[PDB]
């Protein structure tokens, strides 16, 4: 059993008022299933797309999660990840400094 | 119902006689000739022995009845018109029924030169690994050449037995080169099996050519043997590969 | 040089659910997919059936769908067989696919595991169990190698219709094999030291060159990230300095790539 | 024509049910059914004066009044292949047959795989096959290369019913490709 690792990113340069791709990047998990939910204030974003899942080199697997977004100065944008490797979801917060 | 030859060659200006025999009893005695968009024409006929009449078609033909159980037709000069497939048979007034039985035929060839005669040369081509692979099946090619007249039979034989399953051969040959009036023929016939069969080498492959030409009755004055009625054969073990 | 790629992701709950999913890659790019809520492989791309003819496709695919019900149908009576031994959750990967070399050369591959742990491959005319797989493992193999017919169609998928096939995709996408995309790169900062930050986004191909850059003076204590892809079959990629605080002056971030021609992106921290 | 045989050409599919015609110029004596094999042995099928004569698979019927006698196959085999004569007695009691029908039994060829095959000789030239193909597919021809028509498979065959062509030449290196478009 592998503990996920999750990656927030941008597509675009960060621009407040601007449409932009956050992605969410989770990797290294086994089994492959997984449940990823993408929040911006806290609530589920709804059409959120997903890649397909795939595995690296060491069968472990690793999918992303991507949507549309519009950064500001008054919203948070997170990824969560419920895993049986994990007790309790994991989220991970969109940082555009980090 | 018998008849012999079953198969002659001969010259144009030859005294060719073909031998009709039935054991039945039977009163009546008939020769026909086989030819395509006429199907069987009546040549001469017999209600018994001693008599004979014209049938149909009669010029260039005698026909002689002997005895009740053979019925003979003869070639005095025979001409490259009568090459043919000659069919005798019977008939019983005395079971009071119009039904024939008809022998096994018998194939004439008239040719301007016995020396035009030819016997088949024989090759076997092995399947194909890209069929094998792709069908997982596997097909063997025989392929007759340079045989003259047209008539010859082909067969197939796996391990010493005579095989009909998967056999596919031409209904007809091709002429070699069809711009010479005395050209060659060839005839090619396939045999599929499944791939495995093949690949096994305890598996002997063998297609096997019956040539019909020339008796011992005949006279041969050139270098090359015989162009006898004889069997030419190729063959081919399985192999892994 | 470009690698083909078939994965397999099977998966069995219990003796009554089961999900099998699918993907193919051609180099860091995706060709096909294929869920369970899908009857059929689905092309990603315009050139995915690759040289194949409309009936060669056809015929593969049909053999595919066939492979799906059978392998869900086989793996669910090895258990049976396994049992007590194993026990579901039972989680099984594929690994298929061929290497590609210039010229004709070719190295076509088989892996499979079991909860993660590579335990089988596909050699030569047969299923066999790689070194470290467990004892229980030989019993299933033998059922496998049964197959008679089986071993003809993965003989036939891995040495012929495999490097056939990659070879007619790697003619029908080069112009997608061989895309330049110019990169996009941002700085930022994180906090008496701080953290600077050179996110490099949008470049294709992967091999990328990015440095913290003091004059003509790398910076030794650049640390560059993992690369992790964009939704656009694109690479996303960060660098970052560790400085002391006032020794941000004079700080520039370096970008190196095939699609810029020589012309470096250079971002200075203000 | 006394005995008139229609088609001169029949091909049909196995396990069909078809039937074979005979009509007649003038009030004809009685009938007689052949089946002529690719061996050129004439078989008797059925002798009528009157009536129908079923014999397995195979039924005849023969009406004087009306001028004809029929022939009927049921759920056709490789088997029936071959030339079916019918011949009548006519005033005279001159039995007279008619041009012919030939009869070819083709199985249901499902999934076509048309491909054309390069195959080695046994000893130390080459030969091209065209195999896997429908019904409704045809053969071409031409010069110093040969072709076959498809060929006509063996009566007792029960398996492997697979039709296909053969092509060859007296030029080396021939190309196997072009020589089936
Ligand atoms: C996708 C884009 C096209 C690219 C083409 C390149 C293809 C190359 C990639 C090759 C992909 C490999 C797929 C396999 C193909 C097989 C196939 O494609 O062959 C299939 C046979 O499937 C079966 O009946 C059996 C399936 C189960 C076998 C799988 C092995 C099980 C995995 C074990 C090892 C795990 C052991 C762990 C035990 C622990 C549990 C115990 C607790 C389907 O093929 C069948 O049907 C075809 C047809 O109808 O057209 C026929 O043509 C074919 O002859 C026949 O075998
Ligand atoms: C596919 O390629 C393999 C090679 O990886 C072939 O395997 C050899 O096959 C022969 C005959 O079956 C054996 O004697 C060898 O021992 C095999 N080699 C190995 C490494 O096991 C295989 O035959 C090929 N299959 C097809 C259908 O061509
Ligand atoms: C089988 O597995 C599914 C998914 O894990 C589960 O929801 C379902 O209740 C299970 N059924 C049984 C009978 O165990
Ligand atoms: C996967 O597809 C098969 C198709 O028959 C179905 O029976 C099975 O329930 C599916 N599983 C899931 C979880 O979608």
Not at chain 2, 54 to 66: C, E, L, Q, T
Not at chain 3, 29 to 52: C, E, M, V, Y
Not at chain 4, 106 to 128: E, F, G, H, M, T
Request: charged residues 20%; contains cysteine.
């Amino acid at each position: 059993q592998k503990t996920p690792q999750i990656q927030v990113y941008s597509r675009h340069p960060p621009e407040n008022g601007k449409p932009n791709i956050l992605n969410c990047y989770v990797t290294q998990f086994h089994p492959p299933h997984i449940e990823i939910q993408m929040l911006k204030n806290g609530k589920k974003i709804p059409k959120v797309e997903m890649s397909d899942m795939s595995f690296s080199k060491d069968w472990s697997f690793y999918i992303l999660a991507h949507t549309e977004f519009t950064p500001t100065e008054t919203d948070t944008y997170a990824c969560r990840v419920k895993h049986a490797s994990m007790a309790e979801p994991k989220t991970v917060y969109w940082d555009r400094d980090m | 119902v018998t008849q012999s030859p079953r198969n002659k060659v001969a010259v144009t200006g030859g005294k060719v006689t073909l031998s009709c025999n039935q054991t039945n009893n039977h009163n009546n005695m008939y020769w026909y000739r086989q030819d395509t968009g006429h199907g069987l024409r009546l040549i001469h006929y017999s209600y018994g022995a001693g008599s004979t009449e014209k049938g149909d078609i009669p010029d260039g033909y005698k026909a002689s009845r002997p005895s009740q159980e053979n019925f003979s037709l003869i070639l005095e000069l025979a001409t490259p018109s009568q090459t043919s497939v000659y069919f005798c048979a019977s008939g019983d007034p005395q079971g009071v029924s119009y039904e024939q039985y008809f022998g096994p035929g018998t194939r004439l060839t008239v040719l301007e030169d016995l020396k035009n005669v030819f016997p088949p040369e024989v090759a076997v081509f092995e399947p194909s690994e890209a069929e094998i692979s792709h069908t997982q099946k596997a097909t063997l090619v025989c392929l007759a050449t340079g045989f003259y007249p047209d008539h010859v039979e082909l067969s197939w034989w796996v391990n010493g037995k005579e095989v009909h399953s998967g056999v596919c051969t031409d209904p007809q040959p091709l002429k070699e080169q069809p711009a010479l009036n005395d050209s060659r023929y060839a005839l090619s016939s396939r045999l599929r099996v499944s791939a495995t069969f093949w690949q096994n080498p305890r598996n002997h492959f063998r297609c096997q050519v019956q040539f019909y030409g020339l008796s011992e009755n005949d006279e041969w004055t050139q270098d090359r043997a015989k162009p006898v009625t004889q069997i030419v054969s190729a063959e081919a073990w399985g192999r892994a590969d | 040089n470009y690698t083909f790629r078939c994965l397999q992701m099977s998966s069995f709950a219990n003796r009554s659910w089961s999900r099998t999913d699918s993907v193919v890659w051609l180099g860091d790019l995706q060709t096909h997919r294929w869920s369970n809520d899908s009857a059929t492989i689905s092309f990603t791309k315009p050139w995915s059936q690759g040289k194949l003819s409309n009936q060669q496709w056809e015929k593969l695919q049909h053999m595919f769908q066939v492979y799906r019900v059978s392998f869900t149908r086989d793996i669910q009576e090895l258990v049976k067989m396994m049992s007590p031994k194993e026990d579901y959750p039972i989680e099984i990967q594929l690994s298929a696919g061929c290497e590609m070399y210039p010229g004709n050369a070719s190295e076509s591959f088989l892996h499979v595991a079991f909860q993660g742990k590579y335990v089988v491959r596909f050699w030569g005319t047969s299923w066999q169990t790689v070194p470290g797989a467990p004892s229980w493992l030989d019993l299933p193999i033998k059922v496998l190698n049964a197959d008679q017919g089986t071993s003809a169609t993965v003989q036939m998928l891995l040495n012929d219709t495999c490097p056939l096939f990659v070879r007619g995709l790697l003619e029908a996408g080069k112009s997608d094999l061989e895309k330049q995309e110019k990169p996009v790169a941002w700085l930022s900062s994180v906090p008496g030291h701080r953290q600077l930050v050179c996110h490099v986004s949008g470049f294709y191909p992967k091999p990328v060159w990015v440095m913290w850059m003091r004059g003509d003076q790398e910076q030794q204590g650049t640390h560059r990230g993992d690369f992790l892809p964009n939704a656009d079959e694109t690479w996303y990629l960060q660098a970052t300095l560790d400085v002391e605080a006032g020794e941000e002056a004079g700080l520039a971030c370096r970008v190196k790539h095939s699609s810029l021609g020589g012309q470096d992106i250079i971002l200075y921290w203000g | 024509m006394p005995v008139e045989q229609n088609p001169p050409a029949l091909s049909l599919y196995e396990g069909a049910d078809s039937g074979l015609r005979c009509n007649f110029s003038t009030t004809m004596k009685s009938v007689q059914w052949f089946q002529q094999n690719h061996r050129g042995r004439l078989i008797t099928l059925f002798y009528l004066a009157q009536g129908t004569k079923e014999n397995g698979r195979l039924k005849s019927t023969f009406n004087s009044k009306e001028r004809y006698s029929t022939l009927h196959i049921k759920d056709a085999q490789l088997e029936d292949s071959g030339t079916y004569f019918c011949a009548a007695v006519n005033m005279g009691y001159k039995l007279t047959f008619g041009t012919g029908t030939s009869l070819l039994v083709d199985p249901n060829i499902q999934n076509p795989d048309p491909a054309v095959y390069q195959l080695r000789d046994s000893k130390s030239k080459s030969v091209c096959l065209f195999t896997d193909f429908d019904s409704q597919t045809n053969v071409s021809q031409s010069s110093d290369v040969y072709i076959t028509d498809k060929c006509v498979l063996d009566m007792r065959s029960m398996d492997f019913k697979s039709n296909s062509a053969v092509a060859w030449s007296n030029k080396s290196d021939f190309a196997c490709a072009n020589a089936f478009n």
